[PDB]
Amino acid sequence: EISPPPTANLDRSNDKVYENVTGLVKAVIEMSSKIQPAPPEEYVPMVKEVGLALRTLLATVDETIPLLPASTHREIEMAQKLLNSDLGELINKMKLAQQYVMTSLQQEYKKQMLTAAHALAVDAKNLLDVIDQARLKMLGQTRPH
After folding, report:
1. What is each CA distance from 112 to 109, 117, 120, in whole angstroms?
2. How many CB atoms lie within 10 A of CB 134?
């Protein structure tokens, strides 16, 4: 089943064979994890990644809000509160999907978790447009008349 790591006694820094074996193995792993439905064990790590990506976006949007017209703030802040909403729901649906594994509700909680996820990405794209309109507005202001 199992074998030792590849020999440490070869350079690897210009080893195209090593690199191509790596590429092909990854291409197989990527293919297989697409084809197959991930087990609910795997949900948590997947969600932590999404959550990390959110906090980065939010912390960045925090630092951008000082620049933008005061009249744009409430709307940006709402767009953020909405992403947090999507995260709440994502997390709750995840927990429900895990709890109801091997019930008649497995597929439904799964679907609903994905709906929460898809919503989080639509609303991210929406936060971008909100911030962008804010910025163009500020450029209008900054530009003399």
Report:
1. 5, 9, 12
2. 20
What value, to the nearest 5°, has the Cα angle with vertex 45 and ends 32 and 119? 90
Q: Are 43 and 113 in contact (CB under 8 A)?
A: yes
Q: Following DSSP, what letter does each residue of 21-81 receive, concatenated?
A: HHHHHHHHHHHHHHHSPPPGGGHHHHHHHHHHHHHHHHHHHHHHGGGS-GGGHHHHHHHHH
Do residues 107 and 56 make contact, with C-beta atoms less than 8 angstroms apart? Answer: no
Which experimental technique did the depositors report for determining this structure?
Answer: X-ray
CB of 127 closer than 8 Å to CB of 61: yes
Domain layout of the chain by residue ranges: 1-38, 39-145
Q: In sequence order, which residues have a C-beta less than 8 Å from that of residue 64 and are 6 or more positions away?
A: 131
- The DSSP symbol for 145 reads -
Residues in the chain, total: 145
What resolution, expressed in A, was reported for this entry? 2.1
